[PDB]
Design a binder for this molecule. Structure first.
Ligand code: D55
Length: 247
């Protein structure tokens, strides 16, 4: 997150922290996620597409710091790693950038909600806030483009939804942005998602409900003028989600 504030998990209880274990015993941070039900975390496919083996991953819930423990945190294995069949990647865009991780602790259980661990509601079919709506992003991503390490402490910021018309101008993203995507940005271009924020929630208040409107997906650089953060438009993937969170 470029700009914004540091935060703690109690303010983003659905936030999931996703890491990968390597040969040798080292763990690196991969991407953020969001708990949508006790056994299910939603994230972005581009996060896993190169290393699709579900045994390499660790998922934390109730976690505020990158490399240290938080009181109340809970650690999960990935029982099932589902990537989108039609996922793809051009120069800038990822298409169908959406993944499902089925989580279970070492004792075979799903998440237990607590003050620091909660689910976030999905949106209803094609029901999005209007443009100019303020929404929040959360992540462990870079605080500056020149950074080579991620912050140790969770951050959040508030961005505004940008119209498809605005986002589809030649000098923005032209036709690279589709209807299955949403743009969001700071009107003064000082706060943004960045590398390492991939997979995390774009949360908007929808009809009085905190709603998972977007998933951090792509963009050109970080807080660049005329270059918004691009997000998977969750409301357009409800059937995909519904079908893979079953049997
Ligand atoms: C495990 C991560 O393997 C990846 C593979 C491919 C990847 O993409 C290439 C287009 C990415 N994405 C990024 O590195 C990335 C970069 C930026 C600048 C970014 O912020 C844009 C919004 N300001 C985001 C969200 C992700 C990650």
């Amino acid at each position: 997150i470029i700009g914004g504030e540091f935060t703690t998990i109690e303010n983003q209880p659905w936030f999931a922290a996703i890491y990968r274990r390597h040969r040798g015993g080292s763990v690196t941070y991969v991407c953020g996620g969001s708990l949508i039900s006790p056994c299910w975390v939603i994230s972005a496919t581009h996060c896993f597409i190169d290393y699709p083996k579900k045994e390499d991953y660790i998922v934390y819930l109730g976690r505020s710091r990158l490399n240290s423990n938080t009181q109340g945190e809970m650690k999960f294995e990935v029982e099932n790693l589902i990537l989108h069949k039609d996922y793809s990647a051009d120069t800038l865009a990822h298409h169908n950038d959406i993944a499902l991780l089925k989580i279970r602790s070492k004792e075979g259980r799903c998440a237990q909600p607590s003050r620091t661990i909660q689910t976030i509601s999905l949106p209803s079919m094609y029901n999005d806030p209007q443009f100019g709506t303020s929404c929040e992003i959360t992540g462990f991503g870079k605080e500056n483009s020149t950074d080579y390490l991620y912050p140790e402490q969770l951050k959040m910021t508030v961005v505004k939804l940008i119209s498809h018309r605005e986002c589809q101008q030649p000098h923005y993203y032209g036709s690279e942005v589709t209807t299955k995507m949403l743009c969001a940005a700071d009107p003064q271009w000082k706060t943004d998602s960045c590398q390492g924020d991939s997979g995390g929630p774009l949360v908007c208040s929808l009809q009085g409900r905190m709603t998972l409107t977007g998933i951090v997906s792509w963009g050109r650089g970080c807080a660049l003028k005329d270059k918004p953060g691009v997000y998977t438009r969750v409301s357009h993937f409800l059937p995909w989600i519904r079908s893979h969170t079953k049997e």
